[PDB]
Amino acid sequence: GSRRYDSRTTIFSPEGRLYQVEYALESISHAGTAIGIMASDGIVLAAERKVTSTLLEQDTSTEKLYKLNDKIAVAVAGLTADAEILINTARIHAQNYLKTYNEDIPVEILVRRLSDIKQGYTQHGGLRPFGVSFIYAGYDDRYGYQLYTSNPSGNYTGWKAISVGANTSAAQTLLQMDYKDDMKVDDAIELALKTLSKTTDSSALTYDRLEFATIRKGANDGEVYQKIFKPQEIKDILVKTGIT
Amino acid sequence: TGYDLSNSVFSPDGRNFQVEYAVKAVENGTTSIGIKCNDGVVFAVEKLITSKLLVPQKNVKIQVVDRHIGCVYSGLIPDGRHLVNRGREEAASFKKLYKTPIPIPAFADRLGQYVQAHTLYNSVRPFGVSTIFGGVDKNGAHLYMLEPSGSYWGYKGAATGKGRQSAKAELEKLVDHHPEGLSAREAVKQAAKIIYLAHEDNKEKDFELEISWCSLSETNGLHKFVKGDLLQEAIDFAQKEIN
Amino acid sequence: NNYDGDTVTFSPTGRLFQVEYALEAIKQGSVTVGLRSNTHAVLVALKRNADELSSYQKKIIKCDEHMGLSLAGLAPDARVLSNYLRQQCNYSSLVFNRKLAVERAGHLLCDKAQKNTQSYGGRPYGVGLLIIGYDKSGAHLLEFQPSGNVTELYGTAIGARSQGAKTYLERTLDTFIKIDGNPDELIKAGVEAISQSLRDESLTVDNLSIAIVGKDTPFTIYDGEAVAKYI
Amino acid sequence: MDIILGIRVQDSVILASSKAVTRGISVLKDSDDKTRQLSPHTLMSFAGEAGDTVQFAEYIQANIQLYSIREDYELSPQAVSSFVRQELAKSIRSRRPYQVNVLIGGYDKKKNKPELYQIDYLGTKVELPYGAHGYSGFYTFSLLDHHYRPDMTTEEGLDLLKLCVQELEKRMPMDFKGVIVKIVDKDGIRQVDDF
Amino acid sequence: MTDRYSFSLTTFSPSGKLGQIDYALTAVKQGVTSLGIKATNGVVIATEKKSSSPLAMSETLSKVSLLTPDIGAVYSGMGPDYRVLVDKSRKVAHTSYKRIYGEYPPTKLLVSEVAKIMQEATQSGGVRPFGVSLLIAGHDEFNGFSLYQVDPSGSYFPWKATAIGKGSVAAKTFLEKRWNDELELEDAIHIALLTLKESVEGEFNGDTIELAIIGDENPDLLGYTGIPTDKGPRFRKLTSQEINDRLEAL
Amino acid sequence: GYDRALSIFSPDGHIFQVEYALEAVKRGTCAVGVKGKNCVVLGCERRSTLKLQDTRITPSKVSKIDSHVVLSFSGLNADSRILIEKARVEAQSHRLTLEDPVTVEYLTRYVAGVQQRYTQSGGVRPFGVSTLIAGFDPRDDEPKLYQTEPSGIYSSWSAQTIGRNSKTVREFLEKNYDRKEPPATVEECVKLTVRSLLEVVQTGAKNIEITVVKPDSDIVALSSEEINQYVTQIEQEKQE
Amino acid sequence: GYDRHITIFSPEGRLYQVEYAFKATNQTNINSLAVRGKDCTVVISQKKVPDKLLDPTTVSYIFCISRTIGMVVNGPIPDARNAALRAKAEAAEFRYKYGYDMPCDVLAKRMANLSQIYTQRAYMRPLGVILTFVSVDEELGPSIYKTDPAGYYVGYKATATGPKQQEITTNLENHFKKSKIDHINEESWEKVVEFAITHMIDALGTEFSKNDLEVGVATKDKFFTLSAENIEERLVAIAEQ
Amino acid sequence: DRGVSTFSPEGRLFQVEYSLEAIKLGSTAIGIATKEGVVLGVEKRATSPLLESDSIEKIVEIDRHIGCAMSGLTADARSMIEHARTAAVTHNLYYDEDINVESLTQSVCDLALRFGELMSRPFGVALLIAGHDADDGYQLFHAEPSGTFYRYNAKAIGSGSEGAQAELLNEWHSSLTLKEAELLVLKILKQVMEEKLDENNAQLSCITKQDGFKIYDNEKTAELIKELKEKEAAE
Amino acid sequence: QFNPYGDNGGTILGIAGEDFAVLAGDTRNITDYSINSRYEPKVFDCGDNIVMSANGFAADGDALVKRFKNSVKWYHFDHNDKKLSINSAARNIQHLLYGKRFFPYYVHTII
Ligand SMILES: [Cl-]
Ligand SMILES: [Mg+2]
């Protein structure tokens, strides 16, 4: 019968590893680098677009950075199509929580549920896992500003600063060097860009090959604002830090 | 390669090797025939007497569908029974909805589509039988032969099993020598002869003859078994011809 | 070789190897004999034990007051099939107030075994059965094989070294068929038949298993001291 | 079941609930506690159809306790009330709806404010300074309209509550065998033993 | 019986590649060239009509398809896969949008729904990926004109102009030289015909070329009058005659 | 539905998928459980290749199943969440029907049953997780410590360890733990647990987690400085 | 190499099972041809009855799908009949649901979509057949639409199918180059059938008796097949010219 | 790979035969049937000295008149015991009587072959089911994952089974007392066990008509161990 | 509206002795004021020395007896031809009756 053609996606290796999860991570390591940095007064999300063409429409484009609700955003690394499936699920889960409790969903709860979905694809169903790694950047009134990451294994962890995708080894070393706890948002913006500028496989880092976003309490009095940077705004912030 | 390991897989020729392998099982089985006649059809089959311990006349192989259709087959006997069980369900639902008994061509396609369906998936095995069947309906007499692939045609005479070539040759002579037609009672006698002649290809064990028939005049359009005096008369006719 | 992975696959010569391997399980099983006259039908079964401390595996099963079988091969498969026969015999009684014909019993077993040989996932039954019974057309004996093939016989035997008993019955055919109105003599012929399949071992009191059905005799099984008469 | 009251004061929420359990012409019990603790700072009283009341209360209790263990965090009274309302809102269009009315009294530790929610079996939620279910309201609401002040103490709230029970004991047809009173505040939930 | 293939036929290889998606893209590479160019006041999509036989009527086979009155689609790769995608794309525009909001979906969202369908064929049980890349041109009130590409993986990207299929590499280079942000629709049609002549080998006329635009509203193509807000479809398929007129002043 | 029998017997009588799940446990960070006279202590390793972590929000290694029972683990982290969730739900369900919190033996038996079900169910792989379940039964002062593993077998332990280099720390506990006289106090039990982890860990900084469970739902997690004091005390006594 | 057993992509972007289904098409060794007149659409096919024991009346590869639509198949008869039965059911359901007779081209698309599904879904194999649908459509007039195992379909001015299809194709191509039109400029269907047989004789280079051919004719409001004597009458007309 | 319910060329189910190998790796379990009762005894086999041996539950009650001992992948036995207990209690509910030991065993063995592509694989554990009923008296059954069960006068399963079975062959007779049977299980267990036999690493149990199924205490077993050593030294 | 029940009348009587037991019943079957049969037995030998009657609505009574007779048959198959005790039969019948608690057998049963 059909047994002949089954890849058996949800099994262990003799070493005790999940083949498909390991290979999905190998896929993600070729995707454009995404960096998250958490400051005391906000969070920065920076991401490098995958080898851009000059005729690509840049302003009306969304590849790396997505909005989950008003308080939470994600940076993507891997298959975009796979990520969008998970993003719409996450968006729905957030609205279910709000409908049930009349309160915005705590960041970790959203992250756990999305990570639990990925876990399921590694243990049962016989389907391939989602070839996606997220950086979650969000705020709630319990823990304040929070950075998380999840990967195809369904395992998630919290971070002060973190990178996913390509050159994470080199990127993580640079972040570990210059990061400190009393850091401000504007400093974190500069660190994020400087790190990408050194770890990039491109010749020079330009505005058209970047997506950028901040989550500050920079609105008026005790409330959070999400800023998905426009092309011209990335151009200005790149000049202001002296990269171009 | 490996194209022959799974059912429903096309080979580079455009062939389904699993179906061709099922045909080999049919070729291995005992001989069975079908003869179309003036106003009906006649069926006959070779029953190998494996042992003295087999009860004569009590291992019946020819099967009836509805009250007007006869079915006989060569190959895997259980597979044939499964096909007839389906045939009986198909014929029952036709009569249920449309009142009239199922026509033979209509019935032929019902089996055809069912057998063909068992060549579409790797989760099922093709049928290991060629089935000779037919009967009498509103449009007269019809004889059919169905194969593992789902392929079937109408026939003047039909044969399958280990002695199919011997039987086919003998059938072709009847078609040539009787262009105007063969009678029902004649066809019963000829059927006996052809089974006896086809037994030469399976002559280690001696055998038991079994005949059935549908005829508008002789059996009133219904399927019946040939027994008693009419059976012995046909056996004697066959015995006289081999010598 | 490459065509014995499952039952859904034919070999290049048109063979079903999984069905043939199931047939092989019967040959490993202990011998059992069946024979009938015109008035009665008898089952004789050599039971097998694990060792001297163990009991002897029961070979004969009752299906109705007028029908029952003996098994050879996988016993759990015989339990599944005998249970199905019990239900079918019972359906015939409750719905139609009619004792199930022994011939129809065979037809039903054939069709049940067949479905397992044409579908992916499942497997063939790994047991052979000898069904005896007395119905409206007198005494009957059937031989079931898990290929689906069912055969009505005067006498037969299945299991290891069954060829010895089968040859004896083939010689004795004319004698035992006319043992009418005499249960003990028909059993004696069956006990003598199964004896032709014995090697090194002989028939003891907790080794032999006999069953009988007939004109004025319900299907009843004899074990223990009740079979001491026939040794 | 029958009488359940609630009063929100300056620093606490007070719930009064009748002790009688009647079936037919017999008072089967006169010491029944018609409430469940959902979390350390959230209490729910209930009244309605026999069986349904306790089954529903305990079902909600289990769910809130499960949440507490999972997140290692207490849900706000507002959040619990919204969860309860949705469960009743589902129920009303079910094959057999829960016929249970509830009051949810809780102290929000983040806001440092007491909160009282009244929810009927249809899933109709309202936040109130004082609340009641059943025929009780027909006496107590007008009484509290007159005597209630928003800046009252817990002791003043208990005297205000005594005034309600006295009126109910005077004008209600049925003997409800007094009430069990419980206070919800910053320090949690405690029962007044002498009322 | 029954679909026993409940497991993924597309899986990650040790190198991290998704084989079937890569192979699907290879099938797209073999396919005939198609392209799309975005202008200031419109969008153009075009492709060659590769005829299987001269006896075959190439008019009956439509490579450029209307999805909504303001959205059109063209492809490169396997035609049958494209045909069913158009059927599913048209239906999803109604079920998941128009029947809810009483209006047609914007280009980006319809594209998103098509991408979802193609992604599921990459992960669901017992199926292979679609062997096509789509170019979807469209207009909507709040986003204006837009052009999108959709790949077998389910990934989609917005383009100012692009090409896919056989001679896409050369065609994209040609478009980079000619494209500017001040192009009028007629100029974009002119460039589309120039770009396509490079990839086409045999006959080059209105009968072998299929070309459609997303431009101004067409009241004459609406089919009725009386409702002022309803002004007609922006999608228009250029006729065989209309193409030949522009090939003279080429 | 996906039906494939992934966990199956091999010619030598082994279920490789269950045995390979044990390898995943062997890869996981070390976890240790030691029970004293009036308490149980759960110690856990945290690998130090991860700096720039946020320990406030990062999932803790020891999880509360109820107010009186805790669960630590070694192996796949994502898998452990599924077992913990199920256990937490069953804990509340038991309170609802029996009107009494679960015993530690019952909760262990449930979790072990779930793990077993995944070793002979179609379409699923076994949990790559072994657990240490500890606590005190309702109205009982006798300490309880149980272990589970992917196969589904479970048992009670005076002291036990699981995870990477667990055979080294088990060797330590086997000679250092006296059955006749278990750690009489909380301090003694915590020290023995920290000592055992110091055989394997590396540094006693932010690598060791300690959780102490006492009778009547008295559970508390130790902070960095509190644990560091044990590390400082043990090293000074060692230099002798 | 299991990518050649089921319908998934090979490294070079090919579906080998679909390609091998195309080769099953010619397993019967029969050639078919279809042309359009002014008022009609004619389809002809070779009829080969090798066995003497066969009932020749039951040997047919032309099917009456609906009253208006006819279908000829190139491929094995089991798959041919499978496709025919489904097409009949689809045409009937269409009429019931939408209140008018299913057009030839719409049925072709529907059957092509079904064929496409078999190329994408693994458990279903492709049918090893090429379906040629013919009718006189009430909107589009004389119509020929053809389907294959790949799920491809297109309309035709005329067409041919089988082992010697290419010889027949070019023969027809050269005629339409000469006539300068899309169809057979002829009034009666009888002479359009005569054209079809004549040009098949020229292309294949063989002569035909009455039992060597099989003819289907589509006119307005009915499709019908010709008997042996109807063909014989037609063969006599060709010979006497 | 290959089907789960596949036959070998010798006519045996691969998976069933492989599960029998798993049972051979399991700890020893012995049962002896007498006219005064049926005795069940097992090797506990603790993997480490820190493991509290009294938590090793390899002898188990099904009903008051039926007991059970196991050997092999013991985790697999939990659902078998659960089914047995339910079957026993359910029969009592439907028929107001104790259920026959044979009928109970048959019900358990029906689960055995309910695997394929139902559960994914056979059970990897063998059971010794001992009990008493009014009809057939004291009985001992050996239930395998093949779905087959044999009644035994005495039986050993596990790693030391073939050596212990040969010993039981010589020692068993139809006039054994309960006390004699208790010592005989201890004697044979001590012979096949790796580590030295004592009250902590071995467990005894019995089922009698009068008192029903009882697992022995570590104090009671210890005295039987001491009584056994003295009797062997006495000649 | 369709009424699924009817009253077939009749009456039955059971008495127990020291070493015996009787179960009697009249042989008349009726509907309304008509007689259907003057001899239609409703006390049956069900095997294992158990006699049984289900009086009231005959269709339900015959169905129940039929089911219990069948229950006795399967008790033998499943439990090695063991004799069904009168107390065990009673409990089995309770489950037959209660299985239709929400669409009852309109009968008074005596064994
Ligand atoms: Cl369709
Ligand atoms: Mg209200």
Longest dimension (CA), chain E: 63
Alpha-carbon Rg for chain G in angstroms: 18
- DSSP annotation string for chain H: ---TTPBPTTS-BHHHHHHHHHHHHSPPEEEEE-SS-EEEEEE---SSTTB-GGG---EEEEETTEEEEEEESGGGHHHHHHHHHHHHHHHHHHHSSPPPHHHHHHHHHHHHT-B---BSS--SEEEEEEEEETTTEEEEEEE-TTS-EEEBSEEEESTTHHHHHHHHHHH--TT--HHHHHHHHHHHHHHH-SSPP-TTTEEEEEEETTTEEEEPPHHHHHHHHHHHHHHHHT-
Task: State how beta strands G213-219 and G222-225 pair.
Answer: antiparallel
Where is chain E discontinuous (C–N over 2.5 Å), named by the preceding residue? Answer: none
F44: number of Cβ within 10 Å: 24
Q: How far apart are CA C129 and CA C222, in angstroms?
A: 18
Q: Do I and E touch (≥3 CB pairs < 8 Å)?
A: no
The closest alpha carbon to H127, from H190, H164, H172, H81, belongs to H81
Distance from CA of E127 to the nearest CA of A (A): 11
Q: Give me G208's structure tokens.
A: 């035909």
**DSSP class per residue in E177-222:** HH--TT--HHHHHHHHHHHHHHH--S--STTTEEEEEE-S--GGGT
Contact B143 G55 (CB under 8 A): yes
Question: Which position has the token pair 């044969």?
Answer: B159
I86-98 and H77-95 are packed helices; what angle lies between their axes, rounded to 10 degrees?
Answer: 100
Q: Which residues pair with F232 in a beta bridge?
A: none
- Rounded CA-CA distance H43/H30 in Å is 9
Give the span between the Cα atoms of D174 and F48, in whole angstroms.
70
Question: Exposure of F138 by Cβ count < 10 A (0-12 exposed, 13-18 middle, 19+ buried)?
Answer: middle
Single-letter amino acid code for the residue at H210: Q
In order, the DSSP letters of chain G are -GGGTSS---TTS--HHHHHHHHHGGGG---EEEEE-SS-EEEEEE-----TTB-GGG---EEE-SSS-EEEEES-HHHHHHHHHHHHHHHHHHHHHHSSPPPHHHHHHHHHHHHHHHHHBSSSPPPS-EEEEEEEETTTEEEEEEE-TTS-EEEESEEEESTTHHHHHHHHHHHHHHH-SSS---SSHHHHHHHHHHHHHHHH-----TTSEEEEEEETTEEEEPPHHHHHHHHHHHHT-
CATH number, domain at G6?
3.60.20.10
B145: tokens are 């032969």
Report CA Rg, chain H: 18
Least Cα separation, residue F91 to chain D (angstroms): 9
DSSP secondary structure of B48-75: E---TTBPTT-S---EEETTTEEEEEEE
- Cβ atoms of residues C143 and B54 within 8 Å: no
Tell me the C-alpha distance between H18 and H5, whole Å: 12
Whether G85 contacts G92, CB under 8 Å? no
Task: Specify the 3-state DSSP secondary structure of F194.
Answer: helix
On the 0-12 / 13-18 / 19+ scale of CB atoms within 10 A, A143 is: middle
Residue type, F209: E
CA–CA–CA angle E66, E67, E72 (5° rounding):
55
- The CA radius of gyration of chain B, in Å to the nearest whole number, is 18
Q: Which residue ranges make up each domain of chain D?
A: 1-195
Residue E227 exposure: Cα atoms within 13 Å on the Cβ side: 7
Domain count, chain G: 1
Distances (CA, A) of F195 to F46, F49, F182: 15, 22, 15
Task: Tell me the C-alpha distance between H205 and H221, whole Å.
Answer: 9
Strand partners, G34: G43, G159
G201 touches A at CB < 8 Å: no
The per-type count for chain F, helices as H runs and strands as E runs, is 6, 10
Interacting residues of A108 by C-beta distance below 8 A, sequence separation 6+: A143, A146, A148, F57
For the record, the structure tokens of C197 come out as: 């399949």
Burial of F240 from C-beta contacts in 10 A (0-12 / 13-18 / 19+): exposed
Cβ of D62 under 8 Å from any chain F Cβ? yes
CATH label of the domain that carries residue C160: 3.60.20.10
Taking ligand 1, which is a single-atom ion, which protein residues have CB atoms under 5 Å away? G 113
Per DSSP, the residues of F47-96 read: -TT--SB-TTTSPPSSEESSSSEEEEEEE-HHHHHHHHHHHHHHHHHHHH
Among F145, F118, F120, F185, smallest CA distance to F34 is for: F145
Instruction: Give the domain D1-195 fold.
Output: Glutamine Phosphoribosylpyrophosphate, subunit 1, domain 1 (3.60.20)
Query: DSSP 3-state assignment of E34?
Result: strand
Are E153 and E131 in contact by the 8 Å Cβ rule? The answer is: no
Cα separation, A107 vs A138, in Å, equals: 6
Instruction: Let me know: does E175 contact E162? Beta carbons within 8 Å.
Output: yes
CA distance D135 to H184: 78
Domains detected in chain A: 1-244 (3.60.20.10)
Calpha distance A32→C154 (Å, rounded) = 82
With residue E133 as reference, give the H or E element that holds it.
strand E132-140
Residue G161, token pair as written in the block: 């199918």
Cα angle value I91/I93/I97 (rounded, 5°): 120
Q: The domain that contains B183 carries what CATH number?
A: 3.60.20.10
- In this structure, how many other beta carbons lie within 10 angstroms of the beta carbon of residue D193? 7
Q: Residue length, chain D?
A: 195
Give the C-alpha separation, B210 to B225, whole Å: 8
Residue I32, sorted as left (phi over 0), alpha (psi -120 to 50) or beta, turns out to be left
**In chain A, which among 2-41 make CB contacts under 8 A with chain C?**
2
Bridge partner list, D16: D5, D181
F66: nearest CA in chain D?
D69
User: CA of B145: how far to CAs of B73, B142, B152, D33, D89, in Å?
Assistant: 9, 10, 6, 83, 66
**I30, I23, I97: which is closest to I65 by C-alpha?**
I97
Going by C-alpha positions, the residue among C80, C40, C45 that lies closest to residue C60 is C45
* Of C40, C81, C76, C72, the residue nearest C212 (C-alpha): C40
Residue of C nearest to B25 (CA): C14
Angle between helices A185-199 and A168-178 (to 10 degrees): 140
Spatial CB neighbours of G168, under 8 Å, sequence gap ≥ 6: G31, G33, G160, G162, G199, G200, G203, G204
Chain A contact present for F49, CB below 8 A: no
Structure token digits, residue D132: 């009641």
**Does an H or E element contain E43, and which?**
strand E43-48
Long-range own/partner contacts, residues F191-194 (CB < 8 A, 24 or more apart): F191/F230, F191/F233, F191/F234, F192/F34, F193/F32, F193/F34, F193/F41, F193/F42, F193/F43, F194/F43, F194/F227, F194/F230, F194/F231, F194/F234
Superfamily of chain region H1-235: Aminohydrolase, N-terminal nucleophile (Ntn) domain (3.60.20.10)
Nearest to A46 by CA among A214, A241, A158: A214
Work out the number of other CB atoms within 10 angstroms of the CB of residue G56.
15
Neighboring chain B residues of G52 at a CB cutoff of 8 Å: 172, 175-176
When computed from its CA atoms, the radius of gyration of chain F, rounded to whole angstroms, is: 18
Q: How was this structure determined?
A: X-ray
Mark residue F217 as left, alpha or beta (left: phi above 0; alpha: psi -120 to 50; beta: remaining): left
Q: Return the H-helix or E-strand segment holding C231.
A: none
Contact by Cβ (8 Å): E73, E237 = no
- Residue D148 DSSP class: -
The amino acid at residue A120 is: G
Q: In Å, how far is A13's CA from the nearest CA of chain E?
A: 13
Domains defined for chain E, CATH in brackets: 1-250 (3.60.20.10)
Rounded to the nearest 10 degrees, the angle between the axes of helix H178-192 and helix H161-171 is 150
Contact I76, C221 (CB under 8 A): no
Residues 6+ apart with CB under 8 A from G135: G41, G68, G69, G70, G103, G104, G142, G143, G218, G223
Reference D165, options D126, D132, D119; nearest CA is D132
Backbone angles phi, psi at G49, to 5 degrees: -115, 90
User: What is the spatial distance between Cα E80 and Cα H93, in angstroms, rounded to a whole number?
Assistant: 64
Query: In angstroms, rounded to a whole number, what is the distance separating the alpha carbons of residues H11 and C129?
Result: 16
Measured in degrees and rounded to the nearest 5, phi and psi for residue C24 equal -70, -35
Q: For residue E244, give the amino acid letter.
A: N
How far apart (Å, rounded) are the C-alpha atoms in residues G88 and G107?
10
**Half-sphere exposure in the Cβ direction for I95 (13 Å, CA):** 15
Locate all alpha helices (DSSP H) within F99-165, ordered by sequence: 104-117
Q: Which helix (H) or strand (E) holds I105?
A: none
**Cα separation of F198 and F169, whole Å?**
9
Cβ proximity of A232 and A239 under 8 Å: no
Q: Looking at the 3D structure of chain B, how many domains does it have?
A: 1
Pick from A2, A81, A128: CB nearest E8: A128
Among E195, E199, E189, E201, CA closest to E174: E195
Q: Is B45 helix (H, G, I), strand (E, B) or coil?
A: strand
Q: Which of D77, D181, D57, D59 is nearest to D128 (CA)?
A: D77
Beta carbons within 8 Å of D37's beta carbon, 6+ residues apart: D43, D61, D189
Residue in B15, B105, B172 closest to G52 by CB: B172
Q: Which of B10, B156, B176 sits opposite G21 (nearest CB)?
A: B10
For residue A2, the chain B residues in CB contact (below 8 A) are 122-123
CA angle at E172 for the pair E167 and E173, rounded to the nearest 5°: 105
Tokens for G111, please give them: 């059957």
Residue F203 per-residue DSSP state? -
E-strand spans in chain C?
32-36, 40-46, 60-64, 67-73, 127-135, 138-144, 150-152, 155-158, 208-214, 217-222
Chain E residue numbers touching G123 (CB-CB < 8 A): 2-5, 126
- Rounded distance, CA C36 to CA C41, Å? 4
CA contacts within 13 A on the Cβ side of F128 = 30
Q: Is the Cβ–Cβ distance between C64 and C105 less than 8 Å?
A: no
Residue type at A230?
K
Please give the CATH superfamily to which domain F1-240 belongs. Answer: Aminohydrolase, N-terminal nucleophile (Ntn) domain (3.60.20.10)
Q: Is residue I90 exposed (0-12), middle (13-18) or buried (19+ Cβ within 10 Å)?
A: middle
| Tokens 């089914």 found at | H83
G35: closest CA among G122, G198, G160? G160
Q: What strand order describes the sheet that includes D100-108?
A: D35-39, D42-48, D100-108, D113-119, D125-127
What type of residue is C24? E
Give the helix/strand (H/E) hosting B31.
Answer: none
d(Cα A188, Cα A180) in Å, to the nearest integer? Answer: 10
Q: In what order do the strands lie in the sheet with E56-57?
A: E56-57, G153-156, G141-147, G130-137, G70-74, G62-64
User: Where does residue F106 rank: exposed (0-12), middle (13-18), buried (19+ CB within 10 A)?
Assistant: middle
> Is B30 part of the annotated catalytic residue set?
yes
Locate breaks in chain B with C to N over 2.5 A; list the residue preceding each: none
Give the active site residue among B1, B30, B100, B219.
B30
Query: How buried is residue B188: exposed, middle or buried, by Cβ count under 10 Å (0-12/13-18/19+)?
Result: buried
Among H77, H201, H54, residue whose Cα is nearest residue H129: H77
Q: What is the resolution of this structure in A?
A: 2.8
What does the alpha-carbon distance between residue A222 and residue A215 come to, in Å, rounded to a whole number? 13
- Structure-block tokens of residue C114: 């067949």
From the CB of residue E226, how many other CB atoms can be counted at a distance below 10 Å?
Answer: 5
Q: In DSSP terms, which residues pair with D114 in a beta bridge?
A: D107
Within 10 angstroms of residue G123's Cβ, the number of other Cβ atoms is: 23
What is the CA C9 to chain-centroid distance, rounded? 28
Question: At F147, which helix (H) or strand (E)?
Answer: strand F144-148
Question: In the beta sheet, which residues pair with residue B197?
Answer: none
Task: Output DSSP code: residue E97.
Answer: I
* Cα-based distances in Å from C206 to C52, C185, C202: 11, 21, 11
Query: Token pair of D151, please?
Result: 């800046």
Its domain, for residue G47, covers 1-241
Of A157, C27, H20, which Cα lies nearest the Cα of F53? A157
Residue type (1 letter), A201:
D
